[PDB]
Design a binder for this molecule. Structure first.
Ligand SMILES: C=CCN(Cc1ccccc1C(=O)NCc1ccccc1)Cc1ccc2c(c1C(=O)[O-])OCO2
Ligand SMILES: C=CCN(Cc1ccccc1C(=O)NCc1ccccc1)Cc1ccc2c(c1C(=O)[O-])OCO2
Lengths: 149, 149
């Protein structure tokens, strides 16, 4: 549970926003890329796993699941690459809700940056600090610290 | 001190590696950029602060300290922007040592990636996971969790 992340890909302004969600906390990391490729996805996971103890990744689609570059990054970083089949139906909904919330925040900050990537990082900030009470940033640290002890 | 980070800029292969060190743990995040500008430094800090509770940043040089874009990002993200003067002489040495260790790791992984940015993320991964016994990634989580509690 402390080590499980889910990949999520959403679109805006003709660009792609790749998101990793820490399932147990709702904490996120995201980046803007021109298109979702195996190489972009691989690099994103390598970044993520150098930063948090990533044990398992539920990939966002079958192409990233199949991708030999994505499998190579997961091998490199010690990550168990799994499919993203929502055996729990509530998962599709949580992710769609998350994409809608993130797009809302992006629109609230959109005029504060020329580039979409800036707005996306502002939205990540607001999302992770939003007190729900604890924030997602607080919850991820507590979950992992509890795990280490 | 759970919220204090130090910026560090180093060079390799005619490119710039921008590093943020979490002082109390030695945990790092880094990126490759073509040149250190205020815009690049501002964007990097915005990413960092959406991911960890960044309270204070010791800037790496006077230009980033002066930079109005860097000040604007620190304002946006709630970061107290400070100078980086090593009033403590041991700070120079610690950072110099980290740069040499990071470059060493980059050399050990260099052939496993075409692009320097890939090698740099591999190096961040090895650095944050190295047990010295706890790893820097373990120490940062514990420091911040204790703080939240
Ligand atoms: C001259 C700086 C460039 N602009 C100015 C701007 C243009 C249009 C609207 C507002 C602003 C503004 O000053 N917002 C406050 C602010 C500044 C920095 C960080 C957070 C908030 C911000 C910026 C900086 C670094 C970046 C960027 C961008 C970006 O515009 O996307 O993209 C990659 O790294
Ligand atoms: C087909 C992918 C391209 N290469 C292949 C390669 C070229 C030269 C030497 C080795 C390799 C190799 O397969 N290493 C294993 C490996 C693959 C992925 C992640 C970690 C380790 C890796 C790569 C992937 C994504 C990226 C990259 C790069 C990069 O080469 O820098 O840069 C930004 O996103």
């Amino acid at each position: 549970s402390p080590g499980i992340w889910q990949l999520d890909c959403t679109h805006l302004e003709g660009k792609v926003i790749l998101v990793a969600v820490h399932v147990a906390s709702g904490y996120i990391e995201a980046e803007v890329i021109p298109a979702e490729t195996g190489q972009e996805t691989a690099y994103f996971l390598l970044k993520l796993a150098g930063r948090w103890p990533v044990k398992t990744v539920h990939t966002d689609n079958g192409s990233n699941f199949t991708s030999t570059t994505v499998k190579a990054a997961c091998w490199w970083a010690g990550i168990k690459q799994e499919d993203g089949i929502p055996y729990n139906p509530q998962s599709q909904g949580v992710i769609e809700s998350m994409n809608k919330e993130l797009k809302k925040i992006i629109g609230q900050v959109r005029d504060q940056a020329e580039h979409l990537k800036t707005a996306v990082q502002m939205a990540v900030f607001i999302h992770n600090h939003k007190r729900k009470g604890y924030s997602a940033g607080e919850r991820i640290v507590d979950i992992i610290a509890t795990d280490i002890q």
